[PDB]
Paper text:
We investigated a TRPM2 chanzyme from choanoflagellates that integrates two seemingly incompatible functions into a single peptide: a channel module activated by ADP-ribose with high open probability and an enzyme module (NUDT9-H domain) consuming ADP-ribose at a remarkably slow rate. Using time-resolved cryogenic-electron microscopy, we captured a complete series of structural snapshots of gating and catalytic cycles, revealing the coupling mechanism between channel gating and enzymatic activity. The structures of srTRPM2 exhibit a characteristic TRPM architecture, from top to bottom, a transmembrane domain (TMD) layer containing the ion-conducting pore, a signal transduction layer consisting of MHR3/4 domain and the C-terminal rib helix, and an ADPR-sensing layer consisting of the N-terminal MHR1/2 domain and the C-terminal NUDT9-H domain.
The tetramerization of the NUDT9-H domain through the buckle helix remodels the interface between the enzymatic module and the channel module. This raises the question of whether the NUDT9-H enzyme module plays a direct role in channel gating of srTRPM2 on ADPR binding. In agreement with the functional data, the overall structure of srTRPM2–ΔNUDT9-H closely resembles the channel module of srTRPM2, but with some minor conformational changes that may have contributed to the subtle differences in gating kinetics. Our result indicates that the NUDT9-H domain is dispensable for the channel activation of srTRPM2, which is consistent with the nvTRPM2 chanzyme, but plays a role in the regulation of the channel activity.
Numbering used by the authors:
A (entry chain A): 487 to 532, 546 to 756, 787 to 1134
B (entry chain B): 892 to 1053
C (entry chain B): 649 to 729
Write the structure that this text describes.
């Protein structure tokens, strides 16, 4: 194989240290290889002399580490600077020390030695990204089935402690960048590292799931710079709505980032994720208003043109949902989302109500079944308008705190169902002694007790049902046992409106004071997830979007038949990358000097 | 003109409400009232978050409920008043129900039975999930938001009162 | 960036003067309340004849204005002294 032939002598030295560390008894790395189920090229297809002698080759180890970070994580290692013909290139020795320090760094996590990993982290380059990848792979490798066993007990534990050390270390280099310059930190965190398949570092944080790194305000400054198209003029919601409503009267007058420069400024404005988000919010608002005017107005004897507009609108919504499901992510990724399932049930509710309308357009009963089917579409579509509230700062943690509080809501429903079913069966049996069972007795159980919790204590209607003829409201009755409905009603409203609802109040106060900060850190993770979702959105809004899918069909005309697809990517300057690397080395040396002074300045030390 | 006197009293009712509301601006000299005003002005963002949460439930149940009790009706202004009117006062407590039984034209001795439209006895179920979403979820989220809001900015409201 | 830490730590030193100012008021409230009320109604002639609580309000020192000796001076400035 030519992959082992292109491996240099330092890769054989790291493979010799892996074979030397794996020859010890009760080693976790031999249990890691024996539970890997991979090939010697690193593919997971599950020759034997190459699988015994060269099983600890560094490309197979790097593929096991790229699987161990995430499902879609990948690394890229170039050994072609290790030839002797590139010795006269400038900086090839520095990239050789960077690639060898990264490989010995990943071996140092793989042997769980902390100070050697600190030394290869300090002499390495791209320190923040490698610290995030380390902290993720050591925190996942501590909780792994290959490290199960008592004799690898404390190396299960304390290396996880060391994993949290790298997480704290990574935050402080970001804090050292936020100690130095915010604009150089924003140029740092938009830089795509070429060894990690040209991915920016906040996507490395989201794939590494570092919630402590993503809750930092410098990362939120980078994410809010990745909102609004990196344009520092229109940052308000109403200012972006006034810029979207009047594009020609605002965008020459706005600040910058000829006719081609104004066209590049308008193309930078409409490729913002905030502009596509307010276009999707405006398209969903026009959808809910036009389906509200459809369902409130009476349906005609024939098909109306507004029903054809709703058919084309939800046909474009179903085409965008099938394009997000099939050709974008996968079925298991799209089925895990809550709002995708709400979009699928409003597609099914509209098509059930439209098929109930279009089966018999002349029947008024079929129009009654169509409006009763479409009332679910009204409730689910206005409830799906709440999914655009995650971009607001004051609304998103209230949604995550309500989703945390719904377990206490379900505990209150499971407590109140006891009191409601017991008082409802006892009360409806007690006011009607001589009555046969029917459906209306079950409606009389399940109906009135509920609305006596929420406040309407129907009482006259209970005095009329009880047939009590006294001037006192429960007196002179026919049945002598029929004047105990108050007493059951009295102990029911003491059990409902003075016990369980105020237990909710105490449960919501303890629930909100528990998970307020965790709902804030989950809002920061949903903020970068919403910015990454609307960065990959189509530029058109929703009833144009199927026509934009026709433009994706024009990409199909660039795909296989014409095969004339031309694409390019922006290449950064080498002086700006060298300034970012010198900025990273100066901020890392300043943070390790300040952290050594802060560790020596503690009371216990 | 008596109609101009009716327009003058309907214009002056705003002057009554704004003048009695401007009488609250003399409460800042009191020690026990001024931090309650600064804590209410801090708490009005959580009030506006509760209005933005409740407008979803009110507009959705109002359009679905007024469309469901009147299937065969043309659109007018009174359908929009029937959306925006009754759902609100069902949060604050008056669950109009007889009036909904009279509007639903159900002739049974049971309060939602023997109706003309067979789909018209689902207004309770939407009313049931609406009062669980309003009077048991969002208002008590205000309670938790006001407790965390007051325990946040009580001392800052005191220093702003100084 | 090169005036970075002189951005930061002097702000730390700024809070030091704020704490220092409160304690001299506390030393005045250690000594005599009537001499502190005669102190804080005195108009300094180098600052266009302004009393020191107006210097605190123009200086926006909320830690100085939340002190009870300053509230004794403000409630002496209520009720006509
Ligand atoms: C204290 C409780 C839990 C124990 C059991 C008490 C029950 C079985 C007793 C206590 C008082 C009783 C009631 C007292 C008087 C009357 C009037 C009579 O014309 C019909 C029966 C009726 C209405 C009784 C029904 C049964 C009753 C409710
Ligand atoms: C269960 C615990 C909490 C206490 C038990 C209280 C019950 C058994 C008592 C309390 C008040 C009582 C009622 C008081 C008065 C009357 C009117 C009389 O014409 C028939 C019995 C009747 C309707 C009683 C039935 C039993 C009653 C409901
Ligand atoms: C502080 C709280 C517990 C107040 C006490 C409430 C109790 C004692 C009151 C509230 C409502 C009352 C009932 C109201 C009406 C009737 C019907 C009458 O024909 C017999 C008595 C009876 C059944 C009463 C019994 C006592 C009663 C149950
Ligand atoms: C579980 C939900 C969300 C999925 C969709 C269910 C909807 C479309 C179905 C479920 C039960 C259905 C109702 C069941 C029975 C009747 C009686 C019939 O004479 C008129 C239609 C009517 C009133 C149906 C209307 C549509 C209906 C409400
Ligand atoms: C949406 C989730 C929470 C559950 C769905 C419940 C819905 C689909 C169910 C629950 C109870 C059902 C109702 C129960 C009984 C009747 C009376 C019948 O003569 C017509 C259908 C009607 C009016 C049903 C319509 C559908 C209904 C409202
Ligand atoms: C603990 C809580 C959830 C109690 C459960 C409340 C539910 C199950 C109850 C409350 C009110 C009830 C409704 C009241 C009236 C009617 C009209 C009738 O023609 C069909 C059933 C229907 C539509 C009931 C269905 C069940 C219902 C929605």
């Amino acid at each position: 194989i030519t992959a082992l032939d292109e491996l240099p002598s330092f890769a054989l030295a790291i493979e010799e240290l892996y074979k030397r560390e794996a020859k010890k008894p009760h080693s976790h790395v031999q249990r890691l290889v024996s539970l890997s189920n991979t090939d010697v090229l690193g593919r997971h297809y599950r020759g034997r002399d190459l699988a015994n002698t060269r099983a600890y080759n560094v490309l197979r180890m790097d593929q096991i580490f790229a699987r161990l970070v995430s499902k879609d994580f990948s690394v890229n290692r170039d050994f072609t600077i290790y030839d002797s013909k590139y010795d006269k290139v400038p900086g090839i020795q520095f990239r050789r020390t960077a690639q060898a320090s990264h490989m010995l760094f990943l071996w140092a996590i793989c042997l769980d030695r902390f100070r050697m990993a600190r030394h290869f982290w300090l002499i390495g380059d791209q320190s923040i990204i490698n610290a995030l990848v380390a902290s993720r792979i050591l925190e996942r490798l501590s909780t792994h089935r290959a490290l199960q066993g008592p004799h690898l007990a404390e190396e299960r534990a304390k290396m996880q402690h060391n994993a949290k050390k790298f997480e704290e270390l990574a935050v402080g280099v970001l804090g050292e960048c936020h100690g130095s310059d915010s604009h150089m930190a924003s140029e740092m965190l938009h830089s795509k590292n070429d060894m990690f398949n040209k991915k920016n570092a906040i996507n490395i944080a989201y794939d590494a799931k570092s919630l402590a790194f993503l809750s930092h305000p410098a990362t939120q400054s980078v994410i809010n710079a990745d909102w609004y198209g990196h344009l520092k003029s229109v940052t308000s919601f109403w200012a972006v709505l006034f810029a979207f409503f009047f594009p020609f009267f605002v965008l020459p007058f706005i600040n910058f980032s000829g006719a081609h420069r104004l066209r590049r400024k308008f193309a930078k404005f409409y490729s913002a994720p905030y502009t596509r988000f307010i276009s999707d919010l405006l398209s969903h608002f026009v959808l809910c208003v036009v389906t509200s005017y459809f369902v409130l107005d009476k349906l005609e004897d024939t098909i109306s043109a507004i029903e054809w507009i709703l058919l084309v609108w939800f046909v474009a919504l179903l085409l965008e949902e099938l394009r997000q499901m099939i050709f974008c992510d996968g079925i298991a990724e799209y089925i895990s989302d809550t709002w995708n399932r709400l979009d699928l049930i409003m597609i099914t509710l509209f098509f059930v109500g439209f098929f109930t309308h279009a089966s018999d357009p002349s029947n008024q009963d079929s129009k009654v079944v169509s409006k009763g089917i479409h009332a679910f579409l009204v409730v689910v579509l206005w409830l799906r308008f709440m999914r655009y509230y995650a971009l607001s700062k004051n609304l998103g943690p209230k949604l995550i705190m309500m989703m945390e509080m719904m377990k206490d809501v379900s505990t209150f429903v499971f407590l109140l169902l006891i009191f409601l079913i017991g008082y409802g069966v006892a009360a409806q049996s007690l006011l009607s002694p001589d009555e046969d069972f029917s459906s209306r007795t079950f409606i009389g159980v399940l109906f009135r007790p509920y609305f006596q919790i929420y406040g309407e204590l129907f009482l006259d209607d209970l005095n009329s049902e009880a047939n009590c003829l006294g001037d006192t409201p429960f007196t002179e009755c026919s049945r002598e046992t029929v004047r105990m409905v108050p007493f059951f009603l009295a102990v029911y409203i003491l059990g409902s409106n003075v016990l369980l609802v105020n237990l909710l109040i105490a449960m919501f106060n303890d629930t909100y004071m528990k998970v307020q900060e965790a709902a804030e850190d989950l809002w920061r993770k949903q903020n970068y997830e919403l910015c990454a979702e609307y960065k990959d959105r189509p530029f058109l809004p929703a009833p144009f979007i199927l026509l934009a899918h026709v433009h994706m069909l024009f990409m199909r005309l660039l795909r296989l038949c014409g095969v004339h697809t031309q694409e390019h990517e922006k290449i950064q300057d080498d002086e700006t990358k060298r300034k970012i690397t010198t900025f990273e080395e100066l901020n890392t040396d300043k943070f390790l000097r300040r952290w050594e002074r802060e560790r020596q300045e503690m009371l216990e030390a």
